[PDB]
Design a protein around this ligand. Structure first.
Ligand SMILES: NC(=O)N1CCN(c2ccc(F)cc2)CC1
Ligand SMILES: NC(=O)N1CCN(c2ccc(F)cc2)CC1
Length: 460
């Protein structure tokens, strides 16, 4: 039975509004309703991995697992295995996989982060799961961010707190946060970003939704505008939104948006909004294609409609050769020529690089680079031809061209990362000097750039 080179992943996000679900929720797992929907001809084909994010979930883990498994079994006739379940207050993540994948999945991690302080600490935050699927690392974050049209800044802070403090994936990747630890990272939930239009425009917005004219609404979506201005979710992707706003509905119909201020809303307006989102970030030049992104029309127990997204995702095998793992393959090397980092920092310390990759036995520390002043005020750290020669565990091009090198630039004074990035080894040529580039981030904010050239030697 050959190892897969592609899998499909279902991502669900549903704010349940503290109400039990209806008896049938199969439309969610089938990607049927509004937006980019799945072909009917695929209905009996199970996804490889289902990741279900809930918010305001009133169920026990047992009660929700029974509904999820029985739903998938009705759809597929397959009995799914439970990879992971983790709940923080009423925020929950469930990971289910086809039974044929049980012995491909390992290194399962779960964590949560609580956002806010005192007042603002007690029901918002994120849960997460990570694991290895053969040679591929997968991360999944379900977050319920701060609510309210006038708190987009708070939501952006919640995002930075979750990505700093959620402890998933390989702990040896110590300079790297979750936005660098995974081949494929999916981040979803009730992100709670609103359509920022005057309250007096509510009926106009509803009109536009009834005509399926979303362009003038999406141009005011806070998640899209904040992302455009690099305030949040830097270097994440989101599929085009072609479904109606998923919030705020009158329960038991989809015919009405309930937007008016009420004692129950803290006298806040809830203009129709795309609260419920799925984004992703994959390593450079790894195959990832969104095949659905939409909302259900027939699940109406909550004031939110469920959102679905499906993805084709490139995966690699657990490679063994006669040499590595457990030794180097002298027929492999990675050389870095004419490299320099450009940093936004106003500081003056020396810097060195760390190179981390599953293709190395352990991470590699460089010598300090040479600081120069850039024309426009910047710090330029020159490495020239001084960077160590990296010694992969396996030289086979079938393995090595599928790998990635994570780079941290660290202060000699403090050993703190100033910037993290990622370089793909999916090169146009081997034994050839080729340009490489990554942006550098720290706490998921832009801190600079790393560029230069690479020369990759494989056994071929
Ligand atoms: N490395 C480990 O800790 N395990 C134990 C759990 N296990 C597993 C269970 C369910 C599933 F759906 C997929 C994988 C894999 C082996
Ligand atoms: N060249 C790139 O790396 N991107 C990614 C981000 N993207 C974008 C689009 C709309 C929006 F509202 C916010 C961000 C533009 C294309």
């Amino acid at each position: 039975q050959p190892e897969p080179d592609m899998i499909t992943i279902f991502i669900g996000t549903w704010n349940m509004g503290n109400a039990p679900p209806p008896k049938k929720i199969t439309s969610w797992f089938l990607s049927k309703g509004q937006g980019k929907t799945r072909d009917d001809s695929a209905d009996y084909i199970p996804h490889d991995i289902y990741v279900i994010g809930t918010q305001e979930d009133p169920l026990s883990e047992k009660e929700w697992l029974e509904i999820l498994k029985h739903s998938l079994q009705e759809i597929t006739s397959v009995t799914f295995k439970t990879v992971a379940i983790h709940t923080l207050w009423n925020i929950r993540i469930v990971v289910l996989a086809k039974p044929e994948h049980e012995n491909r999945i390992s290194h399962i991690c779960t964590d949560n982060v609580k956002t806010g302080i005192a007042n603002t600490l007690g029901n918002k935050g994120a849960v997460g799961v990570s694991f290895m699927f053969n040679g591929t690392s997968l991360g999944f974050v379900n977050s319920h961010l701060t609510s309210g049209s006038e708190k987009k800044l708070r939501r952006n802070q919640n995002y930075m707190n979750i990505l700093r403090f959620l402890a998933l994936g390989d702990k040896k990747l110590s300079p790297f946060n979750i936005t660098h630890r995974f081949t494929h990272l999916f981040w979803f939930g009730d992100l709670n970003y609103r359509v920022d239009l005057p309250t007096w425009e509510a009926e106009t917005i509803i009109q536009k939704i009834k005509q399926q004219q979303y362009a003038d609404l999406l141009s005011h979506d806070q998640l899209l505008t904040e992302r455009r201005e690099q305030k949040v979710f830097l270097h994440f992707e989101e599929e085009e939104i072609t479904f109606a706003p998923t919030y705020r509905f009158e329960r038991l119909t989809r015919d009405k948006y309930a937007y008016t201020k009420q004692k129950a809303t803290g006298m806040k307006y809830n203009l129709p909004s795309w609260c419920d989102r799925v984004l992703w970030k994959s390593y450079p030049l790894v195959h990832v294609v969104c095949q659905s992104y939409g909302s259900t029309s027939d699940i109406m127990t909550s004031d939110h409609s469920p959102v679905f997204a499906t993805f084709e995702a490139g995966v690699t095998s657990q490679f063994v050769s006669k040499n590595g793992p457990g030794t180097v393959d002298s027929q492999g090397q990675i050389e870095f020529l004419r490299c320099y980092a450009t940093l936004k920092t106003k500081s003056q310390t020396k810097f060195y690089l760390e190179f981390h990759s599953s293709c190395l036995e352990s991470f590699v520390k460089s010598q300090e680079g040479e600081n120069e002043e850039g024309s426009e005020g910047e710090l330029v750290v020159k490495f020239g031809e001084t960077l160590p020669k990296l010694k992969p565990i396996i030289s086979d091009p079938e393995y090595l061209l599928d790998q990635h090198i994570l780079i941290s630039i660290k202060s000699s004074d403090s050993d703190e990362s100033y910037g993290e990035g990622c370089i793909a080894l999916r090169l146009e040529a081997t034994e050839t000097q080729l340009p490489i580039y990554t942006p550098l981030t720290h706490h998921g904010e832009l801190t600079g750039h790393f560029q230069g050239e690479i020369k990759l030697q494989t056994s071929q």
